[PDB]
């Protein structure tokens, strides 16, 4: 029962039938259908062969629209007449007209209210956009309703930026320039977002806290929940998502100053006037957000495959199960992959095989509401994972395109993937007879090494956050995605829309379910190697190179102002010395492993412990400034996220516009000192024990 025995039990037909099963009825967090799906998944995993499958439930705060009083945006004239209403519901896709329990598009946790005022265009609603708006063109956004497009920055940052500018309310729309791909038809003819299409999402700023009412501790049945006023990241002004048919037919009358540049203008046939006023100007818009926030229960599925030799070691494979409406891509295209992997491991166990280490299979809940399922489970099991967790693998949205296989993980995994992809067959068009490694390298080369595929950084934003930004467990993700040099749009056009159906995947994305098969193969090989290898496939020499690169980047970001560094005596020599010591100690450790004999079990356990706890050595118990739950000194999210060393980046952001330069540069020095100490301590953990 080697790697091939498990690898050849993966079949595309099973993935296809599982995906068809999942994407039929709405599966929203806190709804009954999600509970039924969780029960079905638990029963199927028990059938597959896992020793024990159980349900973990948490009571967390979610938000729902008021079905009796649906949310909408209207235009009222001078005498109180609704001369204009937006769509109350996204038009259902063909074949799903009779499907019920489809919540209309809405922004989760949006505060209730009835704001009314003039409109103003703020483009992507980034900080620079408000900078150009009011500090340059002299247009105060206070007491106004801002209109923004979906874009690169996360929507919670958009709403907070609108909040600090005093805006009455925010209106987010998915511009065709950012989502409507050229040439391809709209759904159901193609896969583009139609005018009725609206993108749902949550607009809070949790900063890795999980449940807004129970930050840092699990939301059990005896948890104490803070007041709504003192919550974490809850917005203060109403926000509502809108499709571009409503918007194009909304901002025609908007009149005022000309757009600052072509960047502000999108693709609609709208003048895109930035100044306040409707030019037909006495009328004003009014929003009717009636959303309600309540505490509801969410359920996570946890299945166990106990190890044979090392039951103390946990290798976790997981993903979320909730969806906004259907989830043909996010997340059921990954849930089917997880189901197939679990079935393969179960039949492998049934023939008599059993891995050295424990394997935990996870199905998360309330992830679209702020990662409220994985975070709470990790908070409950913080100690077990801290002292035992080897690695975590996240499976979600196996398909986002049909061009390349993207992988993002900690550097310790870099070598392992290169060994894994060299065996699996490439499913790409052409490239017949080649391994997955060859196709991946050809279609996504690394800038540093021509013959090596590029592996991206593990940027936060999904279920791996609590396992990598707070606990410090080596996390990895692999999924098929599109070209980046030719496809300008971000994600897929039908993201968080109502048209994420099984027909979409079966027709335009994965007709033969071969990319699903190869993504399942990648994830399953990752878990199998991590749970069955004698020596953990971790390489610190891969971490050293990226440490050097990150230090070189942050040094330039600081050296942006050389005369200011010289005036206040800012130096990076401690960080450079720590990184150099890391490289030397990692070299010695690698040679020790190569010399090492594997017959003696206890010393093998010691060596594997040294390999395992390397990632935990980058965790600062005090966390980043004002963000207690972002603790990974190297990869924690920045306060201006989209670079590594978040502390130094945060201290170096907007230092020119500071009242007291000495205090700011002292903070920069403090962050440099913290980073250097953490790197040196991580290096010292790998030195000769005793």
């Amino acid at each position: 029962h080697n790697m091939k025995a498990f690898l050849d039990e993966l079949k595309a037909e099973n993935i296809k039938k599982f995906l068809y099963n999942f994407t039929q009825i709405p599966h929203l967090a806190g709804t009954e259908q999600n509970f039924q799906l969780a029960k079905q998944i638990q029963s199927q995993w028990k059938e597959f062969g896992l020793d024990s499958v159980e349900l973990a439930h948490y009571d967390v705060l979610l938000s729902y629209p008021n079905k009796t009083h649906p949310n909408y945006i209207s235009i009222i004239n001078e005498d109180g007449n609704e001369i204009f209403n937006t769509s109350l519901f996204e038009p259902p896709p063909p074949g799903y007209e009779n499907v019920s329990d489809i919540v209309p598009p809405f922004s989760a946790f949006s505060p209730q209210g009835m704001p009314e005022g003039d409109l103003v265009y703020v483009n992507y609603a980034r900080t620079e956009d408000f900078f150009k708006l009011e500090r340059d063109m002299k247009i105060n956004c206070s007491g106004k309703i801002v209109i923004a497009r979906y874009g690169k920055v996360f929507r919670g940052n958009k709403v907070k930026n609108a909040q600090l500018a005093g805006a009455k309310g925010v209106i987010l729309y998915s511009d065709p320039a950012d989502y409507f791909a050229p040439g391809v038809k709209s759904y159901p003819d193609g896969w583009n977002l139609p005018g009725g299409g609206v993108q749902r999402g949550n607009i809070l700023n949790l900063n890795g806290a999980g449940d807004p009412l129970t930050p840092g501790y699990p939301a059990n049945e005896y948890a104490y929940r803070r007041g709504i006023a003192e919550a974490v990241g809850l917005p203060s002004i109403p926000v509502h998502p809108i499709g571009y048919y409503d918007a194009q037919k909304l901002l025609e009358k908007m009149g005022g100053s000309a757009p600052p540049d072509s960047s502000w203008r999108g693709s609609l046939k709208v003048p895109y006037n930035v100044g306040p006023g409707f030019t037909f100007s006495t009328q004003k818009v009014k929003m009717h957000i009636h959303s309600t926030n309540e505490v509801t229960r969410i359920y996570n599925v946890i299945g166990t495959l106990r190890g044979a030799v090392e039951p103390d070691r946990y290798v976790i494979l997981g993903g979320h199960r909730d969806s906004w409406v259907f989830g043909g891509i996010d997340p059921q295209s990954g849930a089917a992959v997880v189901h197939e992997i679990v079935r393969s491991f179960g039949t492998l166990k049934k023939e008599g095989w059993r891995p050295r280490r424990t394997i935990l299979f996870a199905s998360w809940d309330a992830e679209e509401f702020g990662l409220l399922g994985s975070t709470e489970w990790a908070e409950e099991n913080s100690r077990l994972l801290q002292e035992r967790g080897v690695a975590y693998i996240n499976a979600d949205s196996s398909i986002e395109g049909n061009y390349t296989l993207r992988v993002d993980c900690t550097p310790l995994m870099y070598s392992l993937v290169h060994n894994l992809t060299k065996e699996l067959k490439s499913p790409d068009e052409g490239f017949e007879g080649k391994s997955l490694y060859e196709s991946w390298t050809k279609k996504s080369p690394s800038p540093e090494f021509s013959g090596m595929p590029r592996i991206s950084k593990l940027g936060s934003g999904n279920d791996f956050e609590v396992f990598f930004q707070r606990l410090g467990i080596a996390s990895g993700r692999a999924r098929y995605t599109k070209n980046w040099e030719t496809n300008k749009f971000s994600g897929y056009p039908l993201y968080h829309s109502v048209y994420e159906t099984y027909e979409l995947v079966e027709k335009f994305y994965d007709p033969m379910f071969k990319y699903h098969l190869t993504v399942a193969q990648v994830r399953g090989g990752m878990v199998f190697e991590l749970a069955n290898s004698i020596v953990l496939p971790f390489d610190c020499r891969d971490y050293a190179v990226v440490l050097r690169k990150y230090a070189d980047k942050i040094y330039s970001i600081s050296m942006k102002h050389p005369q200011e560094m010289k005036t206040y005596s800012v130096s990076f020599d401690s960080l450079f010395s720590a990184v150099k010591n890391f490289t030397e100690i990692a070299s010695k450790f690698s040679e020790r492993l190569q010399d090492f004999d594997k017959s003696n079990p206890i010393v093998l356990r010691m060596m594997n412990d040294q390999l395992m706890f390397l990632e935990r050595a980058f965790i600062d118990p005090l966390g980043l400034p004002d963000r207690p739950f972002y603790r990974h000194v190297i990869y924690a999210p920045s306060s201006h996220n989209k670079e590594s060393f978040p502390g130094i980046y945060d201290a170096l952001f907007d230092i020119e516009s500071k009242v007291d330069p000495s205090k700011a540069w002292g903070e920069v020095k403090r962050q440099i000192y913290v980073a250097a100490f953490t790197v040196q301590a991580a290096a010292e953990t790998l030195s000769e024990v005793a």
Partner: nanobody
Amino acid sequence: QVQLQESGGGSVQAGGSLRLSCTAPGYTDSNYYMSWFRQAPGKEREWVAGVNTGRGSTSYADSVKGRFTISQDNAKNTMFLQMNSLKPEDTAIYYCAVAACHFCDSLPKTQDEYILWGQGTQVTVS
């Protein structure tokens, strides 16, 4: 904030030998990723040439190779390009880019990897 005061642009016939200098004040006592990016009229920005002072290795693009050379000035914080035998259709505004490095393992060849930028100018006629 430093603006890498640079000069050396011009407009001559194709095949001419031009020389563009770029210096980074405050970078005299440090290594960096000195490099250049072209901006054709209507096209995008692409890598052209660069030097890694940490290892002192100079690299050029496949098309650029054999036509561009980099020379270091007496002052450490200053590099020169000599463009000899300019092709008829290399008319593109040059952008000098540089990021300070200490270990200086690899030379970035992407625009987004460079921190502090400049505004050059270059036009070549037939």
